[PDB]
Write a protein that binds this ligand. Structure first.
Ligand SMILES: COC(=O)c1sccc1S(=O)(=O)NC(=O)Nc1nc(C)nc(OC)n1
Ligand SMILES: COC(=O)c1sccc1S(=O)(=O)NC(=O)Nc1nc(C)nc(OC)n1
Lengths: 349, 349
């Protein structure tokens, strides 16, 4: 089903701030090579793409890529099948896809000088970090080691080059500024649903606590758990006795309580072990991270919330990676998202 | 005017290579913080988006953004009007838009370490360059000085922030590797037309000399001229009698001659001075750059080519900036592109 009918489509920039260099700009002086002298730079803005169907029904969806990714992951799968953008426009929702600040078409804040440095001010760090193909292979649970696939795999095998090419580094933009850009987008759109992934999971939870217009969250394989400040439960170290999961984010209770006012679903794929796995770090990391999320959702529910954990295997879908929305069964995964939206009337006007 | 019916849409990655860190990857050891140890990194790949109409007519168009830009500039104008992507899908062409290596969703090659450095190897430079808002204002001929508009300007005033937010730095990826990615795309697509802009002007000319599938070129405000090796004509310095335009690119004559085999049109906007303008560097830069391009097109025509220069004011369009395809009269600019495609049979199957 590749055909799609759009009432309108487009893109725009939103959010960000400006920083300035010293001095004055003289238009009679050579403009190239570029100088910081008299310069204004727009930094930390976000790119937003939208596609609206004819006669939309229900709330617009905001798809928010995971760490080191872009909106591409919602456009197409690595093997070229339709992504969630097409599927949900066909499902009669207006769809927004973002490249957050620091990723893709979002701004990378750098100037004339060492990366990230504007004269004596460090806007972002010059030293970067970035996963390897091998790190991403195990992070995303294609298999326990690079080159290997779990038996039930839904990964589009043969398209590894396409898949890994979509990933890259993120400069050290503050998470506050990333959240700020999405809050501004939510203010612009009106009532909407956030659909997050991995690194954007915790960021979307934060956005919802700052933006009443977020009426629901579906988070695919969120990477960092969230708790009320001072109320982080005991979370065990990993099976190597030395590593820990990502430090849970803590927010004041008055903000955490806002998460109890909207439906929230966390979705996990397959091959997360039930028991400690010392031989495979990322598998064990996922075990304990999923556990921490279960406690986070329980925390939301004890405050009167509507938070749930959906393990795709319990719904009859086996072999999903940590990107279930680009796996070979992504249509079925989408069907479960449509089910969530319908249950809560988010597919109704 | 905003409606579009797509037989299919999507995006993919193409081109690039890999580089490897030292050592070995052990999945039992902590994967985060990320390490170069045992790492394979995909670098210099390009992002490609396509939208295909029902019943396409003629050749697909490949829209190639200018320096420091992304495919956003073909999606929408800064004030939210349809870009050339929508207009030409409506004109029944399949439309490709790219983010070239080093820009937007294309790869930015950096690792774990100082920006661009993989251990002892510099893949791209740690020191970046980037235009300011002020430099881009005069580069794009919004007016003679930052914050000032030409009276006749077609720029979408009031949307200055949105416009400048779309611009950013480019890492020092070799032009050879950028051309290589587009050659690979052209091989994948088949016969097509390149539509280029500013910095991508010279790169599209190079692609055509390596790819018979390029059946025509329309270049908006190209930034660097091209000539046969050893046959660069005399080009004057700027009015300051100190500065020069960008050094013309020189290619072997056997490759240059391929440019005579396809229709080529260079398109310029308004407010390029006829006479030396020492007070306004970029205005004077455009005067001499346009002159150099006129000589380049003449050299192609002396080899039997069909290379033309279209000044938009001679077609009745006044006030265009160096981004005519996002200006307020971009529908009229698009009409002139359709005219070029129709005259040369590029809108026929
Ligand atoms: C898409 O990939 C994933 O399935 C996972 S799993 C763990 C991480 C990822 S990720 O999205 O690539 N990046 C991150 O989440 N990185 C990250 N981000 C923040 C804000 N804090 C910290 O703490 C150290 N790490
Ligand atoms: C989008 O803007 C333009 O209408 C123009 S005019 C001159 C350039 C542009 S561009 O596209 O932005 N390129 C760049 O600014 N890139 C660049 N920058 C330097 C410092 N040298 C070189 O030489 C090859 N190219």
């Amino acid at each position: 089903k590749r055909k799609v009918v759009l009432a309108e489509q487009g893109s725009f920039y939103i959010g960000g701030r400006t920083v300035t260099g010293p001095g004055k700009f003289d238009p009679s002086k050579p403009v190239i090579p570029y100088s910081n002298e008299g310069a204004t730079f727009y930094i930390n803005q976000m790119y937003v793409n939208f596609q609206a169907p004819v006669r939309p029904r229900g709330l617009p969806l905001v798809f928010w890529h995971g760490g080191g990714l872009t909106g591409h992951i919602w456009e197409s799968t690595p093997d070229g099948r339709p992504g969630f953008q097409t599927l949900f426009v066909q499902d009669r929702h207006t769809v927004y896809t973002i490249d957050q600040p620091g990723r893709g078409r979002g701004n990378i804040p750098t100037f004339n000088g060492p990366f990230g440095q504007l004269e004596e001010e460090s806007i972002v760090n010059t030293v970067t970090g970035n996963s390897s193909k091998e790190g991403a292979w195990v992070r995303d649970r294609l298999g326990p080691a690079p080159g290997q696939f779990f038996e039930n795999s839904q990964f589009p095998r043969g398209y590894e080059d396409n898949y890994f090419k979509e990933m890259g580094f993120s400069p050290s933009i503050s998470s506050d500024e990333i959240v700020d850009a999405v809050v501004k987008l939510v203010t612009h759109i009106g009532p909407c649903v956030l659909v997050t992934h991995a690194a954007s999971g915790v960021l979307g939870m934060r956005v919802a606590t700052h933006a009443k217009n977020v009426r629901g969250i579906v988070a695919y394989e969120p990477a960092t758990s969230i708790f009320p400040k001072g109320k982080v439960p005991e979370i065990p170290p990993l099976a190597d006795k030395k590593s820990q999961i990502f430090p849970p984010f803590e927010i004041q209770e008055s903000y955490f309580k806002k998460l109890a006012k909207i439906p929230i679903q966390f979705v996990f794929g397959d091959n997360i072990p039930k028991n400690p796995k010392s031989a495979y770090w990322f598998l064990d990391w996922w075990r304990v991270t999923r556990y921490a999320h279960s406690l986070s959702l329980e925390a939301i529910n004890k405050l009167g919330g509507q938070a749930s954990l959906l393990d795709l295997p319990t719904a009859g879908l086996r072999g999903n990676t940590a990107f279930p929305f680009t796996d070979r069964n992504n249509v079925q995964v989408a069907s479960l998202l449509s089910d969530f939206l319908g249950k809560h009337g988010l597919d109704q006007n």
